[PDB]
Ligand binder design. Structure first.
Ligand SMILES: Nc1ncnc2c1ncn2[C@@H]1O[C@H](COP(=O)(O)CP(=O)(O)OP(=O)(O)O)[C@@H](O)[C@H]1O
Ligand SMILES: [Mg+2]
Lengths: 990, 202, 200
DNA sequence: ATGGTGTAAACGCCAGACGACC
RNA sequence: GCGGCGCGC
DNA sequence: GGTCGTCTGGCGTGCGCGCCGTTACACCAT
């Protein structure tokens, strides 16, 4: 129950905090209680046994065994492990050891199984093995002599020991990377990092430094008072133990008072001018105490030195001046040479988590007293609290908040304070990350990271990942590690220009915001007398409009300031970005503020740290990428694109030399800043003696046509539609969303004759973009309401008319030309139906949908009704969109795995692949081989067989089970088409 | 002049000078509370009412009338019933379900609890502005009102008299609010004391 | 199938089978009106209020109690009191003042008319769906109701059973149906006829 | 320079519940 | 979690 | 006890990140 959960959490925490000798006076007193002795022998006796087995002891485990015997429960072969572990570090007379061995042999217990069942530490296991071998040296077992190797058909060539392979290395020596690792370790032992802001400060004054000085002495006084209050409350809470129970103070005694006062003074500076939720503050305090405890326990246990030694050994595989006896994958090399062990920490339940946050919140406000009003007179000289409780309305509910004092806010606003704060995990790593070897082992040095992103709860994905054998996940773990081992650096000229525009009034058309000083002003003021009855209403209506614009401007400038300050911090450095995945297999980076899945400015400040010479064919790909990023032409072959770049050489030179002075040609492109970076790179490459010897750092992008559709045409082979999405070879690229538009608009050229308002107001507004998303989603689940909601927003930004009824558009494609859409795309809808009917019949029997990807990753859907019943509509509308989004990720991971074997730098956005200018063709061949490898196996038959085995096994009733059987056994017939034609298509991922 | 803003009905001062008992009512979105006084600052009744069926998405007058009748059954007889009035208005686009809940509770307690109004036309239920009560006790900062739990904690642990019959009950109520504070229970005593000190006992 | 959506409160069928009189009340922004019947479809009283000091500015319980008590003191005594229920939505950002007025007056009427509720717990005031009566009279266009002056013009000026003494007064009252749009408040008699036709 | 303070009334559809079924 | 916004595939 | 055919209501193509504010605004005459 709740109290059992509280005691289990308390004991499991305090054995980790080295406070078990302090907490030994709780279970004894609670067992002395008669009525409260229930829920005490369940799962906490082995916890204190393991904690006693962690460190040395002298006749301390006799009490545990006596209490277990008095309770009359089964020791379950875990107390004996603790006894063997504590038998070391002490002289043993071998007294009645034969009796102990007989007791081990009797009572149905056997050896060679508790070493993994008890799951002690490596030191404890070694001590137990030594104590066993000191008496009986015959018993000894090896864990595993050969490492497991995958045997699947799609992953047979990667793990094969034959053939010659080339593996890339880093560009930095060993000592430099050792110092970088030391810098990141010292940066991450501190939980926060301070960054100077970007805004321009002017005119300090005497009252400014007076406010700074009174802030300093106030903070010193608060620190002393907070330390005294912590000491007094700890002394008060220590007294209640011997005549009470459930001491909450050991969790407080975990952290030193300096850490507590630091986090409490640094959390007050970020508290807003208005109040905050009291429960949210309690949650934040408990979460931050947990996060600090993790790093403190990791650094006090000696794990840091072992990790440093292993990292220094492992770094020779990446170093530029070191050699290895045999090359291998990073995961296999970390698996060899030894490995550390994951903590596998379990979070404590809510009653012990929120109560201590409440306690710290009550501690902070009571013991912080500002010297009365902070005005210029000092006549009062009284002590009043800085914070007060205020009962308020927020959302649609009454909520109590914790509000500051107006004098404190006025004091804080008077200073400049160009310092910004950041969490450590929000910034990129300054050292290469850890490899992915398990769902538990991660990428950061000290902070644990989850492999599957979940919004809230959703423990079924983790259970499915842990249930499958470990060899299945190797092909995804290797891809995640390879994407994590890419080194980056910051472009400088672009950052300087961006800061120059940022300091002086901004430029909102380039994506950089504008300051609140240039917010719009009302055209007319307000008059008290009612000069006109209509004047007052319009005055209210147009003076209630500017505030929303000002608030939006404030939000945009805040986020841009954060991003630019973090970018400015990482100048003249090299950094790294790890990766994770969601529940359908797609991959994302961990640091949110600054990565490559962002806007144009976030992508134009990133460059490859290691450079490659252009080679014979490196400059042409740069010009093709420049034309691609311009976005002027997306329908022509590569020759016609590279021809265009030679005509704008003067514009490239003028934009590279004087950006903001001369002709601003790089403005007006779809991606201006990326275009400017590419122009600078190309101009530097051109003005050289030998262009083919120039070292370049700019990534080149290759994207796929329509990846969701492209998988449909091979799950069942279609000679129609494959040509539509370029799966089959052709000279000029073929567009689905462009060809749909011509039929969709054919009627309006010849129907405004009957006469309609919506038809003749448009006049050429229709394009590829306006219908792109709706035409994309028709293959997936879509309704007319979502189509209208999509089309309305696209009509909003276009400014020609505010008569926004978008129904002509939603019906015209999903309905009037929908048959034209069936005629345009047909036979892909049979699976779209078959899978939806199968999902419907599974859901009516009360079951969620689960399956396995062709690589081996198991995938499940979490939609449940408000244990709980399956939501039928949400699990039949989401299955087709969530089935293709696993296969595309499988294709990406196979392409990455076979691209790494030839020595290439590979980083991937969904559907778009990035590489050096000299390494494009190899990736283009690997992608078109791996698509055929992936889609030549029968996918729908295996899916049908897994569905039948998982669902149609039970003969509970004849009718529903039989109907499920004949729906799952019925499969659409694949068409006559061969998959050996992908290898010669030029625009498949181009 | 000040009594125009303090109390909303306009009542002649002679009948205020001879009042005997007063009950103060504070509404909430999840509870109601009330207290009783007997001109010697002697507290006799002070209770709350939790576990409602209202404010859960249904606004039907049948359950309102059943719940109000159950609450009004235990309320004893008195010369006046003073009521708490807030500063919410119709102008807020949100916070309208809260306002709709408050006006229904006020109107039904105003239509009930005034038994003889149809005969002689004497009012017996009246409002009191909450900002004025906070300013009397100096609980106002930043154009807002603070909690007031520390004031009533000092009283319970010459301003107000206190018998021994309900002292342990309210100290248990103080301990319950230490775990989870509620201000509907605390605003009742402050409003009653402010009434005996402004309108009566000049 | 109907009585679960006709009447908002729940009551036994036998009590609805045995009735003797109903008072039907319909309110609005400017005034109210009511009518009386006597179990054989025979009118006895049919009145309306002139004007108010309400709904002009602020909302106060004192003026509401004054006006409601002053109006109710003229009511006759009957068996069941039935009042309309308009289905406005909380979700609509507009129509808040009229909704607040309607809910306040519904609560006041339920409070003050349901006499002897504390002793005997039987409900005496009921809420009827307006769209249901609109469908029964079939004047609904599917989204709104039309004017109901046609039925009262056809019935007045063999089953109507108008008493002979009240003909001249009712005719004099109806002769002033050319201003203030008071004829829309004549749906009280229609709702009473509908109740007698769906309760027996 | 400052608080004081007032016065502001836009539509389909399919799948779970409900009065009638047995 | 509610509301207003903005970005990526 | 078990149905239960039908009739009324509530979401509406799938996944992932960031910022802000809880109506103040405006008037006031000292
Ligand atoms: N709005 C949306 N709704 C549903 N799925 C979407 C989506 N946008 C993207 N996707 C998914 O992501 C895939 C990628 O679509 P895109 O690669 O952007 C086609 P595109 O031709 O590259 O668009 P573009 O021409 O504007 O770049 C789709 O096939 C689909 O699976
Ligand atoms: Mg694409």
């Amino acid at each position: 129950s709740g109290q059992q959960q509280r005691l289990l959490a308390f004991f499991k925490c305090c054995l980790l905090t080295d406070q078990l000798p302090l907490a030994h006076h709780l279970l004894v007193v609670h067992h002395g209680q008669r009525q409260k002795r229930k829920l005490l022998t369940l799962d906490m006796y082995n916890a204190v046994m393991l904690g006693w087995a962690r460190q040395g002891a002298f006749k301390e485990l006799v009490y545990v065994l006596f209490m277990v015997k008095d309770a009359g429960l089964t020791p379950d072969l875990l107390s004996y492990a603790a006894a063997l572990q504590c038998m070391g570090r002490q002289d043993q007379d071998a007294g009645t050891i034969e009796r102990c061995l007989e007791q081990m042999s009797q009572e149905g217990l056997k050896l060679q199984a508790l070493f993994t069942a008890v799951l002690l530490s490596e030191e404890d296991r070694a001590t137990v093995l030594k104590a066993v071998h000191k008496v009986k040296p015959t018993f000894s077992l090896p864990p595993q002599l050969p490492p497991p190797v995958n045997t699947s058909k799609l992953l047979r060539d990667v793990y094969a020991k034959d053939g010659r392979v080339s593996y890339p290395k880093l560009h930095l020596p060993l000592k430099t990377l050792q110092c970088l690792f030391e810098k990141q370790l010292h940066m991450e032992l501190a939980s926060r990092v301070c960054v100077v802001s970007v805004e321009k400060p002017t005119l300090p004054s005497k009252e400014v430094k007076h406010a700074r000085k009174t802030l300093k002495t106030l903070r010193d006084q608060w620190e002393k008072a907070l330390c005294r209050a912590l000491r007094e409350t700890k002394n008060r809470l220590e007294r209640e133990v011997y005549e009470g129970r459930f001491s909450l103070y050991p969790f407080l005694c975990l952290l030193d008072e300096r850490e507590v006062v630091r986090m409490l003074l640094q959390v007050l500076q970020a508290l807003p001018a208005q109040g905050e939720s009291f429960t949210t503050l309690a949650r934040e305090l408990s979460a931050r105490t947990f996060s600090r405890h993790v790093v403190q326990r990791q650094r006090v246990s000696g794990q840091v030195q072992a990790l440093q030694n292993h990292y220094r050994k492992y770094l020779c595989l990446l170093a530029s001046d070191a050699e290895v006896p045999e090359p291998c994958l990073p995961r296999q090399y970390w698996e060899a040479l030894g490995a550390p062990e994951a903590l596998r920490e379990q979070p404590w339940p809510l009653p012990v988590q929120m109560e201590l946050g409440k306690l710290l919140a009550e501690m902070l406000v009571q013991a912080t007293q500002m010297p009365c009003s902070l005005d210029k007179p000092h006549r009062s000289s009284r002590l009043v609290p800085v914070l007060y409780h205020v009962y308020s309305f927020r959302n649609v509910q009454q909520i109590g908040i914790l509000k500051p004092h107006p004098a404190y806010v006025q004091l804080l606003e008077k200073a400049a304070e160009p310092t910004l704060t950041f969490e450590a995990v929000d910034v990129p790593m300054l050292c290469p990350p850890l490899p992915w070897t398990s769902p538990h082992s991660g990428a950061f040095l000290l902070s644990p990271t989850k492999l599957m992103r979940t919004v809230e709860g959703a423990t079924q994905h983790q259970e499915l990942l842990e249930t499958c054998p470990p060899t299945a996940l190797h092909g995804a773990l290797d891809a995640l590690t390879q994407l994590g081992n890419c080194a980056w650096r910051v472009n400088g000229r672009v950052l300087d220009l961006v800061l120059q525009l940022f300091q002086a009034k901004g430029c909102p058309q380039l994506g950089v915001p504008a300051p609140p000083s240039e917010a719009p002003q009302p055209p007319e003021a307000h008059l008290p007398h009612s000069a006109a009855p209509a004047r007052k209403a319009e005055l209210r209506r147009e003076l209630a409009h500017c505030q929303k614009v000002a608030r939006e401007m404030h939000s945009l400038r805040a986020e841009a300031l954060y991003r630019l300050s973090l970018a400015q911090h990482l100048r003249d450095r090299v950094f790294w970005l790890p990766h994770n995945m969601d529940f359908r297999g797609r991959t994302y980076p961990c640091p949110p503020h600054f990565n490559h899945l962002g806007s144009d400015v976030a992508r134009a400040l990133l460059e490859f740290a290691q450079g490659r010479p252009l080679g014979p064919h490196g400059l042409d790909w740069l010009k093709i990428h420049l034309v691609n990023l311009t976005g002027l032409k997306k329908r022509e072959p590569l020759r016609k694109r590279l021809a265009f770049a030679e005509e704008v050489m003067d514009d490239i030179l003028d934009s590279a030399d004087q950006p903001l002075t001369g002709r601003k040609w790089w403005m007006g492109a779809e991606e201006p800043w990326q275009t400017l970076a590419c122009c600078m790179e190309v101009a530097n490459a051109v003005r050289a003696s030998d262009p083919a010897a120039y070292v370049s750092h700019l990534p080149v992008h290759q994207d796929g046509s329509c990846n969701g559709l492209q998988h449909y045409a091979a799950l069942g082979r279609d000679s129609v539609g494959a040509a539509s999405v370029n799966l089959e070879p052709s000279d000029v690229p073929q567009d689905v969303y462009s060809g749909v538009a011509a039929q969709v608009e054919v009627f309006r050229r010849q129907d405004a004759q009957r006469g309609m308002r919506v038809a003749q107001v448009l006049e050429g507004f229709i394009t590829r973009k306006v219908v792109k998303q709706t035409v994309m989603t028709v293959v997936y689940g879509v309704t007319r309401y979502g189509g209208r909601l999509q089309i309305e927003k696209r009509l909003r930004e276009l400014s020609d008319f505010p008569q926004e009824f978008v129904w002509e558009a939603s019906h015209y494609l999903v309905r009037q030309v929908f048959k034209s859409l069936q005629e345009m795309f047909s036979g892909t809808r049979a699976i779209q139906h078959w899978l939806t009917e199968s999902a419907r019949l599974i859901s009516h029997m009360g079951s969620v949908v689960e399956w396995v990807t062709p690589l081996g990753v198991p995938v499940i859907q979490p939609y449940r009704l408000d244990s709980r019943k399956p939501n039928t509509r949400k699990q039949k509308n989401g299955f087709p969109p969530n089935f293709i989004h696993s296969l595309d990720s499988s294709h990406m991971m196979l392409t990455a795995l076979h691209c790494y074997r030839k020595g290439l730098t590979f980083v991937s956005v969904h559907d778009c692949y990035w590489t050096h200018a000299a390494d494009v063709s190899v990736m283009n061949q690997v992608c078109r081989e791996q698509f055929v490898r992936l889609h030549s196996e029968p996918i729908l038959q295996d899916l049908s067989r897994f569905l039948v085995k998982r669902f149609c096994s039970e003969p509970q009733k004849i009718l529903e089970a039989s109907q499920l059987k004949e729906t799952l056994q019925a499969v659409p017939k694949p068409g006559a088409f061969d998959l050996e034609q992908v290898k010669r298509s030029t625009y498949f991922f181009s | 002049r000040f009594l125009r803003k303090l109390l909303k009905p306009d009542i002649e001062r002679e009948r205020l000078k001879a009042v005997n008992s007063i009950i103060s009512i504070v509404f909430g979105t999840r509870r109601i509370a009330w207290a009783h006084l007997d001109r010697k600052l002697t507290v006799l009744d002070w209770q709350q009412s939790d576990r409602w069926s209202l404010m859960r998405g249904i606004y039907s007058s049948s359950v309102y009338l059943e719940e109000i009748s159950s609450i009004i059954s235990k309320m004893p007889k008195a010369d006046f019933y003073v009521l708490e009035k807030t500063g919410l208005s119709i102008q807020n686009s949100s916070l309208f379900p809260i306002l709709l809940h408050f006006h229904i509770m006020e109107a039904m307690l105003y239509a009930l609890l005034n038994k003889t109004f149809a005969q002689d036309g004497q009012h017996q239920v009246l409002s009191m502005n909450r900002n004025a009560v906070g300013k009397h006790f100096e609980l106002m900062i930043g154009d807002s009102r603070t909690s007031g739990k520390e004031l009533v904690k000092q009283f319970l642990f010459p301003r107000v008299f206190f018998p021994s019959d309900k002292i342990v009950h309210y100290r248990q109520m103080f301990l319950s609010t230490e775990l989870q504070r509620v201000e509907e229970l605390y605003d009742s005593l402050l409003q009653a004391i402010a009434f005996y000190e402004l309108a009566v006992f000049d």
